[PDB]
C-alpha cells in the first residue's frame, strides 16, 4: 500500500506554499516560516556554507 495507492493521498494537501520573500514553494504554513530563506523565523536570510 505504501507505493502507488498511497500516492493517491498526495492529491489534496500541502506542506509548503509560495514564500513572499524569496518566491520559492517553500513556506511551511504550519511552522510559519520559509524552509529556503527563513522568512517568518529569521529576519536574516537563511543560507548555509555547506550549500553550494
Residues annotated within the binding site for Zn(2+) are: 19, 22, 34, 37
Q: What is the SS3 string spanning 38-52?
A: CCCCCCCCCCCCCCC
Contacting residue, 6, 49, 50, 52, with RNA by CB under 7 A: 6
Distances (CA, A) of 23 to 2, 11, 12: 32, 22, 22
- Judged by beta carbon, residue 5 or residue 52, the one nearer RNA is 5
**Under the criterion CB under 7 A, does residue 52 sit at the interface with RNA?**
no
Q: Where does this chain bind RNA (CB under 7 A)? A: 1-14, 29-32, 38, 40-47
Amino acid at each position: 500500500m505504501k507505493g502507488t495507492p498511497s500516492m493517491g493521498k498526495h492529491n489534496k494537501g500541502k506542506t509548503h506554499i509560495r514564500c513572499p520573500r524569496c518566491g520559492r514553494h517553500s513556506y511551511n504554513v504550519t511552522k510559519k516560516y520559509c524552509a529556503s530563506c527563513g522568512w517568518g523565523r529569521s529576519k536574516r536570510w537563511r543560507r548555509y556554507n555547506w550549500a553550494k
